[PDB]
Amino acid sequence: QLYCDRYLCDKVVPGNRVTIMGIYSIKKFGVGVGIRSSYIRVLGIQVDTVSPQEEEEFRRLAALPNVYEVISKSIAPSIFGGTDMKKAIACLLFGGSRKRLPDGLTRRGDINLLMLGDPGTAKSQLLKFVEKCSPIGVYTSAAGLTASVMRDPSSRNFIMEGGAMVLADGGVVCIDEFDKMREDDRVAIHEAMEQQTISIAKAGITTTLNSRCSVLAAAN
Amino acid sequence: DYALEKEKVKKFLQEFYQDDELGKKQFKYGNQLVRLAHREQVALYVDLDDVAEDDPELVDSICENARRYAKLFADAVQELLPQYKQYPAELMRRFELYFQGPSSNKPRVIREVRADSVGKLVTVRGIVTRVSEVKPKMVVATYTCDQCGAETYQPIQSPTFMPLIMCPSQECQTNRSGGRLYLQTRGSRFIKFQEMKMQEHSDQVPVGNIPRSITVLVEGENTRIAQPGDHVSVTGIFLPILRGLLSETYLEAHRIVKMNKSEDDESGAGELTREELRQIAEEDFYEKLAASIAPEIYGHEDVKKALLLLLVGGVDQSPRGMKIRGNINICLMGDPGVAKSQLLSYIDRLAPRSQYTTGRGSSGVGLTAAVLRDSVSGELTLEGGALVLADQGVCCIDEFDKMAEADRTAIHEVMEQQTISIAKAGILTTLNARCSILAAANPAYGRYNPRRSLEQNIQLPAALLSRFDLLWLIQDRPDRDNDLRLAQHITYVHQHSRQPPSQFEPLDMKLMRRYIAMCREKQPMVPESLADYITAAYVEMRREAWASKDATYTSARTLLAILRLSTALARLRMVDVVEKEDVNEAIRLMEMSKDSLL
Amino acid sequence: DEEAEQKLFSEKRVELLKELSRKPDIYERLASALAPSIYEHEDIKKGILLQLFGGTRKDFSHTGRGKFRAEINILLCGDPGTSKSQLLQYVYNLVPRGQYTSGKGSSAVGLTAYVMKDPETRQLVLQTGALVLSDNGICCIDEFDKMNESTRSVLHEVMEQQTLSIAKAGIICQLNARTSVLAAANPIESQWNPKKTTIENIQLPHTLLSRFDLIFLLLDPQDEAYDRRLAHHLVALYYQLDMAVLKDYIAYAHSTIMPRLSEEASQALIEAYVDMRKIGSSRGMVSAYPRQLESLIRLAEAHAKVRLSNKVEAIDVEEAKRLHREALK
Amino acid sequence: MLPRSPPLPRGNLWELREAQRDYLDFLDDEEDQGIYQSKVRELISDNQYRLIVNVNDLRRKNEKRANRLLNNAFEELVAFQRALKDFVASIDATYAKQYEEFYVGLEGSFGSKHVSPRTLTSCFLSCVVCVEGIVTKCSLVRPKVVRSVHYCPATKKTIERRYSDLTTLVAFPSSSVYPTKDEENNPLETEYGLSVYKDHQTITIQEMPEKAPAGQLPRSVDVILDDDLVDKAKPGDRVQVVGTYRCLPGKKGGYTSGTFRTVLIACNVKQMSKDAQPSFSAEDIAKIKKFSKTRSKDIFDQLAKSLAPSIHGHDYVKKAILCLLLGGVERDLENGSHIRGDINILLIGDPSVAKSQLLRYVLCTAPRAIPTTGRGSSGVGLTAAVTTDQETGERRLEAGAMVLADRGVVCIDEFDKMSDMDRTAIHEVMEQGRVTIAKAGIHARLNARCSVLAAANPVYGRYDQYKTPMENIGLQDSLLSRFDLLFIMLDQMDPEQDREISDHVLRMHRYVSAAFMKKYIHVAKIIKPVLTQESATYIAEEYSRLRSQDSMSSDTARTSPVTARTLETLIRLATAHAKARMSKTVDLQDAEEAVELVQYAYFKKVLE
Ligand SMILES: [Zn+2]
């Protein structure tokens, strides 16, 4: 357990790699008779990992005559055959544009894809690739995909669990075995791709979560 | 200051006139003080409209404080009592004083009473819940020093109190510097006490908000007035609880009035006048009421004739120790849109004790009685269902074909023996549930069809079909003429918001609810000379339903219909013996209930 | 609790009982005094009267056999309106230490024994159901058909061995009781259609029909004479033998009687079982297993107790054989 | 987008003596334009405690004080509220004593103080801030003493006592001992009627979802409403609290942990979203009374054409949806009966016929509309469910969807993916208008007078145009009677309509008045026309001709049964058509406008 201070607060996010320099010490708020608690008072922190000239290697590449295939060729090195199934995936990484008519009746800005066919493990590779090479992306087979309402042991009441499609903001979500997902969960993912938001009205929960992600599904 | 108020209240208590006593100007409180002095009465409901008749200022400063004043009054009467006819002046009180709300104030709701009215006289309306049982609350604890042979007292105010171990008499201490004194439950004084919660009417709540509760400390004479699950109106101070700066509050009831009838409990005021005996003595009194039941509904001249027998009910015997029920059960199988859920909603409001339930929104343990645990004590307690809360009244269950099949056999017990026998793992008992049931249902798949016979476009097991004395069967026959008159009725209704002028104007609900309560307690008999007529009729039935291809399951439980469906009629005509003219009315009913199929 | 109190009978009363027990029909004179509101139904009252005495309480601890049930289980099947539930409602109000149960409002563990988290000590403790609270008396189970086959297969133990073996989380024990079921059911389709076979209107298995020993089929149609007599009787209840004879005759006949078989009675009990097999085999009505041969004993002895005969003779087998035969017809 | 003012700045047109003597001079306000002397009086005529101030004015008047007030809020707001009682006594001293103490809210534009609960650091301690966000709980309103009044029955005197806690602007912890014997000689007795209590709540603002960085669990903050600000916020809102920020310490056993808890002592609240339209101009009402008079022939059709221009075809459905948006007239007879005054519409058809579009438009047009689906909705979660509390542990009745939307609209899409055990929970709340619940420890009846707009995909995936209208719909003839209008919008296969539909949507993908229907229907809703015997004999005839099968046709099937329940839907559509005209008397031209709709919606034709 750590203890950050004035300017070290809000410097790291759950999921980071760090390197702490702290003063290993003991709590003094005064199993065993003389046992104490212990923490590390942090007083140094680190994190482990755009340009004008970099802009030009995007410019010229967008301008070169055969700009289309150069990407769709280098987005699936291992798996080969039928570049259409790789042609399409090139678009999902960019997507259309979000329009707001005068009525505020916004429009989608993402796409969805289904790769039907036998599970022959040729598609899991592709899922892993598209997840790895994405600005935001999650590959799922826990809490679920959409939100749930679960009876908390402590509260003894129902609480709300936003799943994956609420954490992926603009990103891309990959799914396999489209008949394995929980019946309720499959209903909710249907509605989420329909409306692009999840709104549960149950025991003590009436909230809304904007789902803004891209579905790349693989069937069987 | 108050020393001059104790005189301005004595004046009012000794001087007040009243004319409505039916005599001359007597003294409303003049007689009361004598009765109280002769220990023939305990409570003195000092009205506040009468102080607001000659001094509208004192009323302003009562409902402003109402805590000092309720003590000045109990001192004024304490002084006046001897003048008509132990050590502390409270152990010898033996009476209490209560304020009956002033008429100018308006009955608030539970949500409205805020902190700006702590310590003032308020008035709330609500539904009772979780009324406790009477327990003795101490007022003046009496101790004794067994050593020095004395008697001592101390008065209690808080919900707690610390006893005494002194014997503070300086003589006992001075002589010997030693001695303890025992508590004692003889010389002390207790007073009845019970606490009960109130909730808002779920009607007068914002569209989806949670109702709030309040606590009421009934004590003294107002106890045992209110029953749980009840509409009530309470008048009492609104105080905080003793023992940081936040405070929890309770209502300290001074007056409790039942408002079941939507106006004020007038069941005890069910007095029929001679000018109404005029009507009740007419030739066809039975036929006026029948037409004055839910007049907004055209047609159905016969169904309204049976829904009245259900409200009056037959007589119940007990020969050689073999109980026979004296209630009537009725079902209303029929096509969609024939105003069944209107008839039921009306028969709900025309009954002293009634309940409304829907088949698809009620579970089988929630109808009869449920055993539920308290996570505060871990103790299992019983909790009545619908049929228990509707003990001496009527229960209404529409959408009766859609109730789950394991939640419907929990009615077979209440329809014949009229008890509920629970043997779950906390309790083992039989509650009394003497209710008469009235249910509505759709025949097969929404609509009757003439291909399949009965019993297959009804879908009730014979064991339950036979529990119903009258399974009435209506239809949506689209006869061009029958539709024209129905429409010319409903459009008149939507124009004027009333029914078209009928032969006889319907009686008020308030008046029928009394005409019937007077008509229940007759208990007519049966004459022997009729046992040959009745018999033959019954026999004939067992022939037809045995020599037919549609008829239902008739059994020896049908005879008791004819019998108990005629002691109802003979109870309307105010006779004290069943006559051969009512047996034929009953027999006609049991025939006009399945003719809608021929 | 009043077995010591039976010695507290006026000797003026034992004369009365012993003398009433000599009239040639004291059987039909006591039986016909049960429930003086049902119509004739002459046999069902005979069965329900023999159930209030029960066979002897023999002591089989020596033969290592175990124990031996001495009470009689009775089943009533028949089409609606035939006054079954009234007989249960009457018995339940007569016998002390009894219960009344129903079909859907009773579970598997609520009838025999459940395990509850005791609130204070937070520990699992055992409790007793309905078939164990009766324990000396009758456990009326109405609506016998409408209990899913799970909760119906529980009666197999408590109604034949008079025991109950529990093995749950921390409780491993073996109760016992001396109850006697009295059940009432409806035929399947709730209508006794005579096209099907008797073992098809009941629709109960054989491993459950054999634990009963008096299956009364109330086959009653629209007999124009019966209906007329019944209606004439029922209407009479609207105008307007003793008990303490029966209430004391029963205590006596329990306290100081123990019918032991004979050799002339035992020689009519062997053939009465060798014919039952050939009869019940073909018809397809209800087969007969050796358990019935014990029931006859149970019935025969129970008849001898009615007349205080203290010894089972021939006629006490012919009666309780005609009763066992003329109930399924 | 940054909210740098409570009044949306884009389209607003359409010692301690110096402070106290400067606030008074600011509150004079007479000599320049009399802005506040027009507000003090205004509130005295309404009997209010507090008045809202614009700091934007304090700036122009005196910059130094405007800065010293946003950085030392406590010592400045204890001097503002003093020199406000001073200035109200300078108008009506009789009023200036009715109330114990006055209060003063704030509003305007604070420079860097407009923060979110995520940015509210510990450099804003004792500084006016303006927090925005969602309320996600409330507390139980409880009194709280600020003064006692005691009494000596022996000495006939009267002593008082002033209370103060850590939730004041002065912050001295007083003990609530309630003295019973000041001097050991005399006994005391409290007088509750003459004491002074106040209200007290505690809500929890939480950061807006679409403003979170989405990686964490958005931050929260605790607000302490008071003194008739109390019930001004329910769970699920979007508020802009404007209150001082404060840390309140503690000590359990003479040894304090340095850790403190920080709260926000609110002194104003603002609902950000405008969810009402009663603000109309006299020019607007003039326009309205013009338009309602111009042509009585064609105002309904002209209204409905302009309903949803973003959709091509479906004129009938738009007509009926307008009828929904108006509503009938709820008659309650004298004996206590009640007849509903709403219209429930059902739309079935092949995929992609703009059903969801019509629903999503009816949502935004009408006020108080609630959306719902066919799988994210249980039979009990629609009406009311029993639960308990976490603080008290005693049961209560949480309101479902169709009880929140009272006097409103409920939009149920994919009404067919709802199990049979779930539709049945509606038959009471769609006709009788109120929900009845008898659960274990709950017996209640909630008012749910609403109207249902539902959309359902047909069985077989697509509407087989040959079977029959009854086999393409799974609903049983008991639920099919509740919904009084059934529109079969099967995918328009005719080649013409698709052409203009494509034109329209593609034009949209290359980027009567709209904001006038709002006011016009919000006005024409209240009118309550009354039948007349000229038409009431025409309806009473068209129904008796509908009810006769022969007069219908051959080779024509029935979508839904005609009962005595469609009769009073004729009456409802009629008096909802004479609500657009603002007519107040239905005529024979109405009872004929609403009969063709029925003739079209009830009977379908089968092919082979
Ligand atoms: Zn003493």
Side-chain angles (χ1 to χ4, degrees), chain C residues 13-85:
Chain C
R13 260 292 197 177
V14 179
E15 320 195 339
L16 275 161
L17 308 186
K18 284 166 174 167
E19 72 94 16
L20 292 161
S21 45
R22 298 192 189 106
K23 312 186 175 186
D25 43 343
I26 181 60
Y27 193 32
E28 311 177 353
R29 192 191 175 191
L30 273 186
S32 300
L34 281 188
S37 278
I38 320 294
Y39 200 47
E40 46 190 359
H41 271 158
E42 65 183 63
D43 270 0
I44 305 195
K45 300 172 184 183
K46 303 259 200 62
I48 297 183
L49 176 69
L50 295 182
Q51 194 179 44
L52 296 188
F53 286 133
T56 41
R57 308 196 300 259
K58 306 172 187 64
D59 192 75
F60 287 144
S61 54
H62 196 267
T63 40
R65 164 193 181 84
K67 43 188 52 65
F68 166 75
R69 193 185 90 218
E71 291 87 4
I72 317 185
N73 308 327
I74 293 183
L75 177 58
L76 308 178
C77 177
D79 54 2
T82 41
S83 178
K84 292 182 292 297
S85 305

Side-chain angles (χ1 to χ4, degrees), chain D residues 62 67 79 92 167 319 387 389 395 414 451 455 461 475 570 578 585:
Chain D
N62 183 16
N67 278 327
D92 183 295
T167 70
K319 198 177 291 180
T387 51
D389 312 276
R395 302 189 188 194
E414 293 177 350
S451 43
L475 315 186
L570 292 192
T585 80

Side-chain angles (χ1 to χ4, degrees), chain C residues 296-311:
Chain C
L296 279 183
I297 297 173
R298 262 191 277 277
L299 279 173
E301 309 179 346
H303 183 199
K305 292 193 176 186
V306 185
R307 49 172 200 162
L308 309 174
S309 163
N310 212 331
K311 170 202 60 178

Side-chain angles (χ1 to χ4, degrees), chain B residues 145 148 167 169 172:
Chain B
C145 184
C148 78
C167 188
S169 64
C172 181

Side-chain angles (χ1 to χ4, degrees), chain A residues 85-123:
Chain A
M85 294 179 70
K86 316 170 185 188
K87 279 190 163 193
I89 305 190
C91 318
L92 184 133
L93 302 195
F94 301 111
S97 182
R98 178 177 175 89
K99 316 186 174 60
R100 169 182 290 109
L101 309 182
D103 304 313
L105 271 172
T106 80
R107 297 307 196 184
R108 298 199 65 182
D110 268 18
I111 315 91
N112 302 326
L113 278 148
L114 191 63
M115 311 163 269
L116 196 155
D118 60 350
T121 311
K123 293 176 291 302

Side-chain angles (χ1 to χ4, degrees), chain D residues 132-184:
Chain D
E132 297 74 353
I134 294 179
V135 179
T136 78
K137 76 186 296 181
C138 316
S139 159
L140 201 55
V141 190
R142 293 189 196 176
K144 168 183 191 69
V145 69
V146 287
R147 173 183 303 161
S148 86
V149 163
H150 290 238
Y151 185 87
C152 298
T155 81
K156 312 159 190 54
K157 301 183 307 177
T158 304
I159 73 176
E160 288 204 27
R161 188 67 60 89
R162 206 177 184 90
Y163 283 99
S164 282
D165 196 69
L166 274 196
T167 70
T168 72
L169 301 158
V170 194
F172 193 93
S174 192
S175 60
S176 162
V177 178
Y178 273 48
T180 187
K181 292 168 186 179
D182 201 359
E183 320 288 340
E184 185 269 309

Side-chain angles (χ1 to χ4, degrees), chain B residues 326-556:
Chain B
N327 301 11
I328 313 179
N329 313 342
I330 284 172
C331 199
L332 293 188
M333 203 65 60
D335 289 345
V338 197
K340 306 185 308 292
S341 307
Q342 293 284 318
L343 280 168
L344 300 204
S345 90
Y346 186 84
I347 306 292
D348 166 33
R349 308 193 302 275
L350 194 66
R353 307 198 47 160
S354 87
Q355 282 277 328
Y356 200 74
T357 321
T358 292
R360 196 36 186 77
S362 89
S363 89
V365 66
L367 287 185
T368 67
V371 48
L372 52 88
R373 285 198 299 274
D374 298 333
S375 302
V376 54
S377 88
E379 214 62 40
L380 316 96
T381 79
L382 210 50
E383 178 70 26
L387 303 184
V388 165
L389 299 183
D391 202 0
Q392 292 279 11
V394 192
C395 182
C396 311
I397 322 171
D398 39 349
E399 316 282 9
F400 187 73
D401 209 317
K402 301 143 181 176
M403 198 188 311
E405 191 44 56
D407 306 349
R408 201 203 302 184
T409 60
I411 315 297
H412 293 205
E413 177 76 321
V414 192
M415 289 212 219
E416 278 309 288
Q417 292 81 33
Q418 299 192 332
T419 62
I420 288 169
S421 62
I422 302 179
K424 311 279 177 46
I427 308 94
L428 166 55
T429 183
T430 64
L431 308 103
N432 275 322
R434 325 170 196 87
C435 74
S436 44
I437 304 188
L438 169 61
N442 293 337
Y445 298 132
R447 173 176 316 278
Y448 186 104
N449 48 358
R451 309 267 65 90
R452 304 185 288 186
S453 85
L454 277 89
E455 312 169 75
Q456 39 182 343
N457 60 70
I458 286 188
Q459 284 188 347
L460 298 177
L464 178 60
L465 160 68
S466 68
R467 311 292 186 105
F468 291 114
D469 311 341
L470 281 176
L471 197 140
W472 194 272
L473 188 37
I474 191 66
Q475 186 173 355
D476 72 3
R477 291 193 297 274
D479 289 345
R480 172 119 215 184
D481 348 329
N482 124 77
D483 308 329
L484 185 46
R485 293 182 183 174
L486 172 56
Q488 293 177 335
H489 182 110
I490 309 170
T491 70
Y492 186 112
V493 170
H494 286 267
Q495 287 178 30
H496 306 289
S497 157
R498 192 180 156 169
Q499 74 287 355
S502 64
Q503 293 177 335
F504 177 80
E505 293 177 350
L507 304 92
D508 189 14
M509 181 174 294
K510 183 178 179 180
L511 188 45
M512 298 195 54
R513 198 184 296 116
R514 155 192 296 158
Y515 265 106
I516 280 174
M518 184 207 177
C519 198
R520 292 185 77 100
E521 283 83 354
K522 294 306 295 176
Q523 284 81 18
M525 290 279 294
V526 181
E528 314 83 358
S529 45
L530 261 177
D532 293 331
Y533 189 30
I534 307 177
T535 302
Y538 167 60
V539 184
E540 194 72 5
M541 294 186 184
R542 295 300 297 276
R543 172 167 301 107
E544 174 57 36
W546 179 33
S548 175
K549 281 304 301 171
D550 76 320
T552 45
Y553 194 82
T554 182
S555 83

Side-chain angles (χ1 to χ4, degrees), chain C residues 121-302:
Chain C
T121 186
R122 291 323 205 196
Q123 292 206 351
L124 304 186
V125 304
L126 193 82
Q127 297 298 338
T128 37
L131 271 166
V132 188
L133 290 181
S134 83
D135 166 73
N136 210 317
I138 300 197
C139 173
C140 303
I141 307 179
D142 210 337
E143 297 288 330
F144 196 87
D145 188 338
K146 303 169 186 47
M147 297 159 54
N148 43 352
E149 198 61 30
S150 69
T151 172
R152 189 187 302 162
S153 57
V154 159
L155 321 184
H156 288 175
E157 192 170 10
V158 198
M159 91 187 306
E160 161 68 6
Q161 305 160 338
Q162 310 269 100
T163 196
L164 175 67
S165 301
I166 307 162
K168 277 171 188 172
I171 314 299
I172 299 187
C173 70
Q174 168 164 353
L175 276 63
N176 48 5
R178 285 194 175 172
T179 170
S180 57
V181 192
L182 166 61
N186 283 330
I188 208 165
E189 179 63 287
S190 47
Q191 186 78 40
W192 184 275
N193 63 330
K195 256 170 165 48
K196 305 166 66 182
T197 43
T198 309
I199 189 61
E200 284 291 351
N201 301 146
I202 311 182
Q203 213 67 46
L204 295 181
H206 279 91
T207 88
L208 175 60
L209 275 181
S210 87
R211 287 149 206 271
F212 296 99
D213 47 29
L214 286 179
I215 304 181
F216 282 123
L217 295 174
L218 275 66
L219 295 174
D220 289 345
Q222 300 80 354
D223 289 345
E224 293 177 350
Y226 176 56
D227 304 350
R228 293 182 183 174
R229 293 182 183 174
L230 168 62
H232 204 63
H233 163 89
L234 266 182
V235 177
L237 301 190
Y238 272 71
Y239 324 131
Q240 176 254 333
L241 200 61
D242 209 331
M243 268 294 300
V245 50
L246 169 79
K247 184 185 193 301
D248 281 348
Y249 195 92
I250 286 190
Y252 182 66
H254 276 167
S255 161
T256 81
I257 291 284
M258 223 75 59
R260 282 273 167 266
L261 276 73
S262 90
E263 184 266 299
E264 283 294 3
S266 156
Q267 202 48 45
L269 271 183
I270 295 180
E271 311 151 351
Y273 170 69
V274 188
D275 65 350
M276 270 188 166
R277 298 280 276 177
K278 300 170 183 173
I279 288 174
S281 43
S282 61
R283 320 266 66 81
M285 55 177 71
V286 284
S287 312
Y289 309 115
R291 184 180 269 122
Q292 268 64 242
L293 184 48
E294 313 176 351
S295 167
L296 279 183
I297 297 173
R298 262 191 277 277
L299 279 173
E301 309 179 346

